[PDB]
């Protein structure tokens, strides 16, 4: 059982510039690696062939290096379809290991988020439930704290988070934030808000409801 | 004592011959002797099956055969009856009982060179299995996909041989190694090979 | 060149099931193929090798004595038993080609799959329930206000949500299924419109489940 570590597990690539992924290995493999690319939703495809071998069909840009137990992918010239999860496998002796992940993504300038509020329908409440729930918009850096706060109390349970993945489009994001309780404690309570920090924003925006 | 089997040419020539295309030598009507083997002092392998590694000036034989092939190191464990692997397989295999000696040793001071020596090839797959000292040169590109390759090698369009890539930074592995194995025989005809007196 | 999985699904602990692989626009009689499968947040793992004819099989350690591969070259197909199904089995299964043909030396892959799910789980089918997000006052914003519906509570995972009949496909965003306590799936979806356009047009939610026959539409309600 050879371990094959590949680093780093994130990373975010500017529109231009050279990125480098590793991948290393326990044990000496001579060239008896490969390296592949799957974007989210399709199949795998074949990259690159005994860790220098360009494979017929693919771009330029993508190149590989290393022999013993130290390789090296190297991107050039990056561009925005190149952002997809690259791994390395090993195909030396039984049984076969693959690395770890690797995630790129595309960087652009901070957008500040829009937050907005939902409180829970009527049906819910003939149900003998409630949900309170609070979305984030268009913000470029994941970093985004929400916390509830219920009668200035902050409440660390039965809380749920729900995060989209990289927009295509102009690389964006979006996010919600959910609070179930019983329609009993739901009653007993009056105001409710959810607080928001992110680095794109001047100070902390807290949205609140009470009825 | 003044003919003698020329055994410098197969143990000592400038560069042996791949591992898929190797040579057959006939050695008869000369006088052998042994003893000039060991100017390869350093003998990694030293095998001699159905006959004693020493008296080998004992016995007057036929003919011997020399078969020479270059190897990666790693697979000189193929060289044996009854074995299987890339090389029995499909570049050159053993006859299931054997008689005579196999002798390897190590050239990485000569064939590795600094850029990758791209002289030696092997060859990948094939439908069937070789025989024992049987020898294939057949280059033909496997058709897998449906549209025809028409002499070029491309996807679903396969060459059936890749070079060793040969290089002075390497392990104990993957680094050349050269072999000869010399077959002995006897068969009705008078024996016209054995050892000066 | 393709290859297609099929046969997933979601069993109960403890019982069997199979799973088929379909190759086609080549020769699949000349190839070997692997058996792959990916855990949920880790890394692949191998699982299983067969050869070109059949002979030589090669299973990983943490499967051995309960999954069997073999293959059908007449019928092109490539299948998979699991027997005595665990809860570390939850994966996505893919199926690949070895590069070379007539080789049993290499153990070297080029050509992947779209890959099937295996759920290992004892819960009970259930309806989706949908609820809508009504609109307030302060969920408009510079002209434009955001509403949606909130599916909730259902064991089959995949639920198809639409606007409009599929007409409202912009600045609409759905989020991943996330789990809950209880252990059946809920999540929602959120499309933003222009506050001018609130009680003029009509918004309904396209909820539409496959496992069950769920047919329940909602359409928003101003408020």
């Not at chain 1, 592949?36 to 190149?63: C, D, H, M, N």
């Not at chain 2, 009982?97 to 090839?121: E, R």
């Not at chain 3, 998979?80 to 070297?108: H, I």
Request: charged share 15%; glycine share 8%.
């Amino acid at each position: 059982e050879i371990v094959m570590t590949q680093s780093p597990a994130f990373m975010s690539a500017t529109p231009g510039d050279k990125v480098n992924i590793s991948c290393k290995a326990s044990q000496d493999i001579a060239d008896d690696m490969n390296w592949y690319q799957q974007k989210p939703g399709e199949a795998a495809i074949f990259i690159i062939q005994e860790a220098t071998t360009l494979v017929p069909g693919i771009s330029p840009r993508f190149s590989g290096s290393g022999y013993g137990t130290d390789f090296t992918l190297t991107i050039n010239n990056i561009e925005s379809e190149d952002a997809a999860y690259y791994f390395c496998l090993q195909h030396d002796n039984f049984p076969l290991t693959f690395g770890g992940g690797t995630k790129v993504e595309i960087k652009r300038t901070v957008a500040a988020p829009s937050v907005f509020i939902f409180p829970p329908s009527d049906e819910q409440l003939k149900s003998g439930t409630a949900s309170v729930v609070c979305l984030l918009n268009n913000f470029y850096p994941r970093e985004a704290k929400v916390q509830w706060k219920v009668d200035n109390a902050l409440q660390s349970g039965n809380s749920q988070e729900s995060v989209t993945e990289q927009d295509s489009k102009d690389s964006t994001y979006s996010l919600s934030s959910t609070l179930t309780l019983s329609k009993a404690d739901y009653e007993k309570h009056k105001v409710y808000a959810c607080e928001v920090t992110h680095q794109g924003l001047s100070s902390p925006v807290t949205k609140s409801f009470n009825r | 004592i003044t003919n003698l089997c020329p055994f410098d040419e197969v143990f000592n020539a400038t560069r042996f011959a791949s591992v898929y295309a190797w040579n057959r030598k006939r050695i008869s009507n000369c006088v052998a002797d042994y003893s000039v083997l060991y100017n390869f002092a350093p003998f990694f392998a030293f095998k001699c099956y159905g006959v004693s590694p020493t008296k080998l000036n004992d016995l007057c034989f036929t003919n011997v055969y020399a078969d020479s092939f270059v190897i990666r190191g790693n697979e000189v464990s193929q060289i044996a009856p009854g074995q299987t692997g890339n090389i029995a397989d499909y570049n050159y295999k053993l006859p299931d009982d054997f008689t005579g000696c196999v002798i390897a040793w190590n050239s990485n001071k000569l064939d590795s060179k600094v850029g990758g020596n791209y002289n030696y090839l092997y060859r990948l797959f094939r439908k069937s299995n070789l025989k024992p000292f049987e020898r294939d040169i057949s280059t033909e590109i496997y058709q897998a996909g449906n549209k025809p390759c028409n002499g070029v090698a491309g996807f679903n369009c396969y060459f059936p041989l890749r070079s060793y890539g040969f290089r002075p930074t390497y392990g104990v592995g993957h680094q050349p190694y050269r072999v000869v194995v010399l077959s002995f025989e006897l068969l009705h005809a008078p024996a016209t090979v054995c050892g000066p007196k | 060149v393709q290859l297609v999985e099929s046969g997933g699904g979601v069993v109960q602990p403890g019982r069997s099931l199979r799973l088929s692989c379909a190759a086609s626009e080549f020769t699949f009689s000349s190839f070997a193929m692997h058996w792959v499968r990916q855990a949920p947040g880790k890394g692949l793992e191998w699982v299983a090798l067969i050869s070109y004819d059949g002979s030589n099989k090669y299973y990983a350690d943490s499967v051995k004595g309960r999954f069997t591969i073999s293959r059908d070259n007449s019928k092109n197909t490539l299948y998979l038993q699991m027997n005595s199904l665990r809860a570390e089995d939850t994966a996505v299964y893919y199926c690949a080609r070895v590069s070379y043909p007539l080789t049993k030396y290499y153990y070297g892959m080029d050509v992947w799959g779209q890959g099937t799910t295996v759920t290992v789980s004892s819960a009970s089918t259930k309806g989706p329930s949908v609820f809508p997000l009504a609109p307030s006052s302060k969920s408009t914003s510079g002209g434009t206000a955001a509403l949606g519906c909130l599916v909730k509570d259902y064991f089959p995972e995949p639920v198809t949500v639409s606007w409009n009949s599929g007409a409202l496909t912009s600045g609409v965003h759905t989020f991943p299924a996330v789990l809950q306590s209880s252990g059946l799936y809920s999540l929602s979806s959120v499309v933003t419109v222009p506050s001018s356009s609130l009680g003029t047009q009509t918004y309904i939610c396209n909820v539409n489940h496959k496992p069950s026959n769920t047919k329940v539409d909602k359409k928003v309600e101003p408020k």
